[PDB]
Amino acid sequence: GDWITPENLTEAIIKDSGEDTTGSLGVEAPENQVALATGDFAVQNVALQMNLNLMNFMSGLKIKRIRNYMLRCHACFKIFPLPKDGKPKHFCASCGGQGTLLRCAVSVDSRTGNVTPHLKSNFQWNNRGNRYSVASPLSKNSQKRYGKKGHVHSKPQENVILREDQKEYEKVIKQEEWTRRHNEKILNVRIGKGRYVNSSKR
Amino acid sequence: SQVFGVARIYASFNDTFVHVTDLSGKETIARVTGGMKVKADRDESSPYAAMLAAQDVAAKCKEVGITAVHVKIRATGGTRTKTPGPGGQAALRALARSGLRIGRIEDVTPVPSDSTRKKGGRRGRRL
Amino acid sequence: KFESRKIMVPPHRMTPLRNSWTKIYPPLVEHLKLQVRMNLKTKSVELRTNPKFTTDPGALQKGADFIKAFTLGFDLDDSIALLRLDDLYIETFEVKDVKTLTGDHLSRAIGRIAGKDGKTKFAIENATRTRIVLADSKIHILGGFTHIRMARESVVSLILGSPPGKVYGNLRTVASRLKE
Amino acid sequence: VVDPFTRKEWFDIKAPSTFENRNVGKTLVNKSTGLKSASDALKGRVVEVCLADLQGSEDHSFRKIKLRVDEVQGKNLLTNFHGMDFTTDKLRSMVRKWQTLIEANVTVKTSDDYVLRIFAIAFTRKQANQVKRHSYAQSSHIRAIRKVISEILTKEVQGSTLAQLTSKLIPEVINKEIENATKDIFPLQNIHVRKVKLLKQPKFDVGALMALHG
RNA sequence: UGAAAUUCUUGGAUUUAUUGAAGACUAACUACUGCGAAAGCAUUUGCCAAGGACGUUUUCAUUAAUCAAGAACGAAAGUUAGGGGAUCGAAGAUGAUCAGAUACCGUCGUAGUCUUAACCAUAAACUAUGCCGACUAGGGAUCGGGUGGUGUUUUUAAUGACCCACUCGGCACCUUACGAGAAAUCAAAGUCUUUGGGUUCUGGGGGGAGUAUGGUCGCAAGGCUGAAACUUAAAGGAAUUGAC
Ligand SMILES: [Zn+2]
């Protein structure tokens, strides 16, 4: 690995944000009247295709082409910017596919202004856990399990999350934010069933 | 020169031993045990007593001229329990602050491939 | 001039560590002034002391103990007490040390410690000011020396088979004696 | 009151030339007398040292060496190889759920007719594209693997010396040979020679010992 | 140990180091995995004989299902004789008798625990669910075998390991209720007042009582079979609510 030290600490903290502290990371490449030095790929992405000038502040040269990562849904083939927590969202915002977003290598050119994905030509698809038995809400079995006490507010006859706009989903995303802030100042969840749903748990 | 010794710590219920030897283990430089530094049986296992014993050993090492020490930590093992108790943890903390250098550290508790019968009968016994 | 300790993380704990990594090194590097790195070649973390900017010999042990508690499975905010306080210890044992029991007898025994919804474990951690984790057959108890013993002697009686109701009564007695 | 440490004398331990650096450390004995000689108390007296010290590289740190004192001269203790072992923490790191543990051992005689016993360990592993969890082997495979390993060990001994064997263990070249031979049977990982224990040894001579020193 | 005493020790206990002997056991890996009629079975290698499933355009041609009498096997403890005798340890001999969480604790130790040759025939020997056959139901996980793939890797083929689809057999799981049930619950505990696929065993309110007596098996301890007089209004199952 690499040693963290009390001198290096601030740089390491920035690296864990995902920002390029080194400069020239993945760089592949009216006169010079303005230039921008920045280490954030999200800003760089906008700058390049608007035909702005980017400055490699580690070296003093303008950048024409760069390679980085973005998300791509393999169902509908649409491309999305990588969120700043650095992992996929659960649902595709276009087609509503569940878990279909994969991180994909991408290149950008000032010259063309276009965006190009790079695909692994020998990809093997994994299909473990795509299909499984799930309860139906209107079965006679379900109506017996529901019980005689009406809606139980503790252990709330749990219903699985399967849609983006299901009201159950709205709670978990905001509650996740709340628990984050509470725990961090005091110190100062998963959806679907995963691949192995079909293997019995003792 | 550092001139390494080796420290053997044996912690159990009821008492703790600190012990230090030449690198070959044949010659013993100092010992002292928890029961030497306290007035009553119920206190022999306490962490407090273990700290005193470790401070005493550290002094005598410097007098002979030992300046660094490897450490081998041990529990009773065998058919008994395997992990060093808090009285052993306390002794290790005290040595680290004594100003001796600590070399490599290793756990040497004896574990059987498979054992003879444990004392206590079929109904179990309060450990 | 240099001294270090290397300690290893077992695989089921690996992912929790990654998710927390940005939380644990700032307290070590700032408050203890140690230096640290995660060595993914061997699934270990390494703590190293620089003699030029460190305060006292106790720093290096505190750091290792803090990380050691985390790999045993204590919560991050429970482990952090080992940086702040000075007299906390860990004790551990496994149920086969108390009584030899094997099949469904073994499963029922650890169920008897947790209790329904964990409520029995939660009770023990309140009547004695301590934290408890159950990692299959092994129990770890974190706390002060005299509190640890009070916890041990009551978890033991559950695995010897006493009914939970009888144990709740004992916890009431111990709690009042601490009040005195 | 004797205060025995006034009576003690220090000596230096010298490792044989097979290892990188040879100043191991010091030991002490009570100062000799005409009544009985100190040298009889020095002979034997095994010493255990981390291999990462002898070679000066930290990647050796999980292996330990035993050295036996055989000769005394000039307040130097001159020593010879006596055994090898793993640290107990490392061994517990390897043993994990959802895989098979394979062991083999054999007893064999060197060309200079030391008699020793040697232990090997290996674990099964997943293929890069596996999807199932637990990577177990069938018992027909385990016998075949165990047979191949025993064949290799019994030909790497009958190397010309006990010393030559030591020169093989340090760079751990034996691990790579087993890797190639089993490649066709099953994918394996963490192949190691775990332990060497010396059972019997020839009648002593000084000639060989001095060749390993100066 | 909750606290302590009996006990061991300046001839050196406990602790450290180098060697040796004996008897028992087979950790981690170890799981909602495997094998066997059941009891039950886990270190390596060799020999001996047996077994299920699968594959089959091989062979015989009803040779089958269940089962009184009768027969083989049957945990632990226990009995008779020889061997062995590390550990633990009914009985026995001893230390303390204080203290309500730790209220049952410490030391030594006979038979036994292991084995050879004969006995015994019990267990919550439990899935508390007799065996054979047909139908009502679907999914993907796993163990063994087989078929297909322009599939991946080992390598330039074959084989091995892995991936995808299909199929026979097995230990389980999730979903489903035409149904069943007093309910808990149930892939059988379904196809039963719309009552009949074949066949073996057992019960008839609670005690007296698994007692007495006869027989039979056993060295013994005991096993198998097994009453009546008399007495009594309940004993029992599942599931609701919640006093001081
Ligand atoms: Zn999409």
Closest CA to D186 of D109, D96, D125: D125
Backbone angles phi, psi at C34, to 5 degrees: -75, 170
Q: How far apart are CA C10 and CA A117, in angstroms?
A: 37
Q: Is B7 helix (H, G, I), strand (E, B) or coil?
A: strand
Question: Token pair for residue A152?
Answer: 């139980």
Considering only CA atoms, which of B33, B30, B29 is closest in space to residue B88? B33
CA distance C51 to chain D (A): 21
Cα(D214)–Cα(D210) distance, rounded to whole angstroms? 6
SS3 state of residue D195: strand
- The full set of domain ranges for chain D reads 6-214
Does at least one atom of strand E sit less than 7 Å from the CB of D41? no
Look at the block and give the residue holding tokens 């007098």: B63
The annotation status of A104 as a binding-site residue, yes or no, is no
Q: Does B70 touch chain C (CB under 8 A)?
A: no
Q: Which bin fits C136, alpha (ψ -120 to 50), beta or left (φ > 0)? A: left
- B123 — contact with chain C (CB < 8 Å)? yes
The backbone torsions φ and ψ at residue A57, rounded to the nearest 5 degrees and listed phi first, read -65, -10
Stretch (H or E) spanning C178: helix C164-179
Query: What would you report as the CA-atom Rg of chain A, rounded to the nearest whole angstrom?
Result: 23
How many domains are contained in chain B?
Answer: 1
Any contact of B with A, at least 3 CB pairs below 8 A? Answer: no
- Other C-beta atoms closer than 10 Å to the C-beta of A74 total 13
Q: Which nucleotides on chain E have any atom < 7 A from a protein Cβ?
A: 1-5, 14-19, 23-33, 43-46, 86-90, 100-103, 105-106, 138-144, 151-155, 159-165, 172-178, 185
Burial of C115 (0-12, 13-18, 19+ CB in 10 A): middle
Which domain range does residue B71 map to? 1-127
Provide the chain A residues 97-116 that lie in CB contact (below 8 A) with chain C: none
Chain B residues closer than 8 Å to C60 by CB: 96
Give the chains touching B; criterion: ≥3 Cβ pairs < 8 Å.
Answer: C, D
**CATH code for position B124:** 3.30.420.80
DSSP tag of C97: G
| Measured distance CA(A74)–CA(D9) in Å, rounded | 77
Angstrom distance (rounded) from CA C88 to CA C78: 11
Q: Which of residues 1-20 of B touch strand E (CB under 7 A)?
A: 8, 10, 13-14, 17, 19
Report the alpha-carbon distance of residue D151 to residue D140 in Å, rounded. 17
Please list all protein residues whose beta carbon sits less than 5 angstroms from ligand 1, which is an ion.
Answer: A 73, 75-76, 92, 94-95, 97
The answer to whether D197 and D86 have CB atoms below 8 angstroms apart is: no
3-class SS of residue D189 = strand
How do C3-8 and C138-143 pair as beta strands? unpaired
DSSP label of A46: H
**HSE-CB for D55 with a 13 A CA cutoff:** 18
In 3D, which of C153, C177, C175, C157 has the Cα closest to residue C166? Answer: C157
Tell if D101 CB is < 7 Å from nucleic strand E. Answer: yes
A189 touches chain C (CB under 8 A): no
Residues ≥6 apart with Cβ < 8 Å to D82: D46, D66, D67, D68, D198
The CA distance from A176 to A165, in Å, is 17
D187 CB and strand E closer than 7 A: yes
Give me the amino acid identity at B92. L
> Is B24–D27 a contact, with Cβ atoms under 8 angstroms apart?
yes
Q: Is the CB of residue A131 inside 7 Å of nucleic acid strand E?
A: yes
Kind of pairing between the strands at B4-11 and B16-21: antiparallel
- If you count them, how many residues does chain D have? 214
Contact D161, D187 (CB under 8 A): no
- The DSSP annotation for D106-175 comes to EEEE-TT--EEEEEEEEEE---TT--SS--PPPHHHHHHHHHHHHHHHHHHSSSS-HHHHHHHHTTTHHH
What's the A81 CA to ligand 1 centre distance in angstroms?
Answer: 13
Which tokens hold the place of C164? 């939970």
Alpha carbons within 13 angstroms on the beta-carbon side of residue A104 total 23
3-state SS, residue D186? coil
Buried-exposed string D67-101: b where 16+ CB fall within 10 A, e elsewhere: bbbbbbeeeebbbbbbbbbbbeeeeebbeeeebbe
Phi/psi of residue D157, each to 5°?
-75, 165
Beta bridge partners of residue C36, listed in sequence order: A4, C47
Judged by a CB distance cut-off of 8 A, whether residue D59 touches chain B is no
Residue A95 annotated as lining a ligand binding site: yes
Can you read off the two tokens belonging to residue A192?
């679907």
Q: With the CA atoms of B13, B19, B23 and B25 taken in that order, what torsion angle do they form, in degrees rounded to the nearest 10?
A: -80
How close does chain D come to A122, measured CA to CA in Å? 12
Report whether D183 contacts D201 (CB < 8 A). Answer: no
Q: Is A76 annotated as a binding residue?
A: yes
The set of residues, in sequence order, having a beta carbon less than 8 Å from that of C45 and lying 6+ positions away, is: C6, C7, C9, C36, C37, C38, C39, C67
- Which residues fall within 8 angstroms of residue D175, CB to CB, at 6 or more apart? D191, D192, D193
Token reading at B13: 């219920």
Query: Could you give the CA distance from residue C26 to residue D15 in angstroms, rounded to a whole number?
Result: 44
**Is there a contact between B55 and B94 (Cβ–Cβ < 8 Å)?**
yes
* 3-class secondary-structure state, position A87: coil
- The CB density around residue C37, as the number of other CB atoms within 10 Å, is 17
Taking a C-beta distance cutoff of 8 angstroms, is the pair D120, D153 a contact?
yes
Structure tokens at C54: 């460190």
Per-residue flag: B28 CB under 7 A of strand E: yes
Q: Is B107 near strand E, with its CB below 7 A from some atom of it?
A: no
